[PDB]
Design a protein around this nucleic acid. Structure first.
Lengths: 5, 240, 153
RNA sequence: GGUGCAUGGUUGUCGUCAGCUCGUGUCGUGAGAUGUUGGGUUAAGUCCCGCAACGAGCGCAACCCUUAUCGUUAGUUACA
RNA sequence: GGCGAAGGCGAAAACUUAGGCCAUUACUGACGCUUAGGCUUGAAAGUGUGGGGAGCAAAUAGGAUUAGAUACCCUAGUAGUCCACACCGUAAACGAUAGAUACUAGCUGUCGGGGCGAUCCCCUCGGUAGUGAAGUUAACACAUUAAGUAUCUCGCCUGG
RNA sequence: AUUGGGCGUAAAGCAAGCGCAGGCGGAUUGAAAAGUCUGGUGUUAAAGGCAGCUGCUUAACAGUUGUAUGCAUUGGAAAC
């Protein structure tokens, strides 16, 4: 799952 | 437009009769052509997901590396991308261990800074051999680390033009826990890469299309205009 | 945090004029509360190999979960031409001790367990056997998640 | 006086020989390899082009002396 | 390259004869596999009953080399090398890889056959080989013809 | 080596085959219950160990209640 911060 | 499918005209297709079941969800049963093509809908949603992910990562000032080692065309282009928005790039391969640490990078970048601040005075004041040697390691730092001279730390993201053309790069990528984005063909392995991009790279048209896609993903991230993927104009650029 | 030694071996690549004698060392470390690592190294002298092995163990850290101070299930690990069998034990039974096996169990911090070996007893091969046995540990929560039966039964 | 199988130092040897290694990282479960590989390149690992290798050290070169050319300080106890 | 269970099979012709592959909308009905002992076959050599023997060549003879050559280099040459019957059954008699049984990435091929057609290419079902994923192994390696996966069985190994 | 091994090269797949006995073996549905599981019944002595206890100052020891499968037999079971 994306949205890597 | 939003990566409109009408413009999409040489993204389906790759080399013939070397595919693996890892691409089975990407290719329909084949008799008409034998030149392995792709499926339009799947590549559309995959590319939309990749674009959204890279933009979302890129608001927080993520760092992206580009594999600039395919012939010339995509190379000079991704050079231009990596230059107007200043991030890390390469023009030559990794020699192995290029992305494993920072000491080899740190001593190298200090050598580059010393070189650029020193030889600006020396053209004939020192020996001729000195001038030739210094220009040589100038060229050398340009080949490897003139594409990367701004690392606070190794990049948070990277794009691979072709993994079966850069086994070593994706190897070090999988060694680290770093997220990975890479192009995918019918010879590539979409089981070690973290983001699937089923697009051809042999034809430069597909390379420049996905090129503009990434450039527009990183551009609007840092408040830069958007030449495609939001412009209804069909991408006009032709091969050289 | 523990850094207990394992073994010392003399290793030498051959060349003209003599033998390239040097030491080879292995170390295994564990927080005794879940995290564990290992590292083997070679060097002409002790400190280089010791530092290399400790740093490798730091890089090769991997984690396990506490299971009432035991491993609550039957597991067989096959690696390095040897088999290791791990099975739990009641609370008031105590812990058995085989040198490398006991070392690794202590690094994982257990007080009661039963373990048997089968085959060759070279140290690094017990390291592989134990990591094979412990890395594929099953959790009740995970098997519940991969099922619709969220209670055991 | 013996004991260079108790020694240090010193010297010969391959040998003016080009290899000796190490740090980082990777591969191989290991002894190891990777570098040090290959194509050019010369005497040299001296150098270059690519390569899972990047660097660093050592011998390697330059910084010692003389010869052959010239300017200049000096001109006798040389020169005449 | 093909056919063979194996040993192995390559001048032509004829005769007797075994086995295989393809679809069987034709059929019986589980009648199937293994196989201790039991039986058949089976490279080379060899022995009797004789043949034949162009070369070959053990054994042997002579010469040359060699310190020693008793071997090797050479010239002869016996048995034997081939035919019909009786026996010996063992060998690096190897895929150093048992039988049979289905299931499991792929690719490069090759052969036979049914569709089809100038060939050529294609699909298909079997055979024959190479590359090679996962996997299995101490390693080499093996890998749809497995040393994978498992299964019924016999034979076998308990350090030198 | 049932638990709990292997035979490509470390020891071993016979040279291969025709196979008797033997072991194993497609699906369906029927009886019956041989194997099998299970509930009662007779029996499985003493003693030893196990658990509880009594006696010696304390255990060793002795004594005491249960504790030992399995065989036959009555009743269910029909998945193989």
């Amino acid at each position: 799952m994306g949205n890597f911060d | 437009s939003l990566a409109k499918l009408g413009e999409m005209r040489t993204h389906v297709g790759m080399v013939k009769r070397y595919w693996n079941p890892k691409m089975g969800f990407f290719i329909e049963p084949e008799r008409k052509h034998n030149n392995d093509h792709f499926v339009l809908e799947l590549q559309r949603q995959s590319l939309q997901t990749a674009y959204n992910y890279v933009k979302e990562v890129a608001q927080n000032n993520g760092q992206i590396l580009f594999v600039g080692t395919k012939n010339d065309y995509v190379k000079k282009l991704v050079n231009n991308i990596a230059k107007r928005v200043d991030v890390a790039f390469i023009t030559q391969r990794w020699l192995g261990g290029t992305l494993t640490n920072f000491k080899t990078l740190s001593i190298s970048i200090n050598k580059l800074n010393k070189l650029v601040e020193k030889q600006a005075e020396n053209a004939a004041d020192l020996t001729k051999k000195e001038n030739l040697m210094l220009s040589r390691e100038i060229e050398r730092l340009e080949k490897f680390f003139g594409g990367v001279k701004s690392l606070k730390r190794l990049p948070n993201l990277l794009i691979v033009d072709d993994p079966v053309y850069e086994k070593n790069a994706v190897a070090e990528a999988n060694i680290l826990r770093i997220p990975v984005v890479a192009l995918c063909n019918t010879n590539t392995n979409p089981e070690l890469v973290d983001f699937i991009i089923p697009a051809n790279n042999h034809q430069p048209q597909s390379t420049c299309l996905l090129m503009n896609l990434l450039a527009d993903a990183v551009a609007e991230a840092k408040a830069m205009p958007t030449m495609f993927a939001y412009k209804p104009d069909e991408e006009i650029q032709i091969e050289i | 945090f523990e850094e207990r030694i394992v073994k010392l071996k003399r290793i030498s690549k051959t060349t003209k004029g003599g033998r390239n004698m040097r030491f080879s060392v292995l170390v295994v470390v564990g927080n005794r509360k879940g995290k564990i690592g290992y590292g083997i190294a070679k060097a002409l002298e002790v400190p280089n190999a010791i530092k290399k092995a400790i740093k490798a163990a730091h890089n090769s850290l991997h984690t396990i979960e506490i299971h009432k101070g035991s491993i609550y299930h039957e597991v067989i690990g096959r690696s390095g031409a040897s088999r290791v069998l791990l099975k739990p034990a009641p609370q008031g039974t105590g812990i058995i001790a085989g040198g490398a096996i006991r070392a690794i169990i202590e690094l994982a911090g257990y007080s009661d367990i039963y373990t048997k070996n089968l085959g060759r007893n070279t140290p690094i091969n017990m390291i592989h056997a134990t990591m094979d046995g412990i890395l594929k540990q099953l959790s009740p929560r995970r098997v519940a998640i991969l099922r619709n039966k969220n209670l055991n039964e």
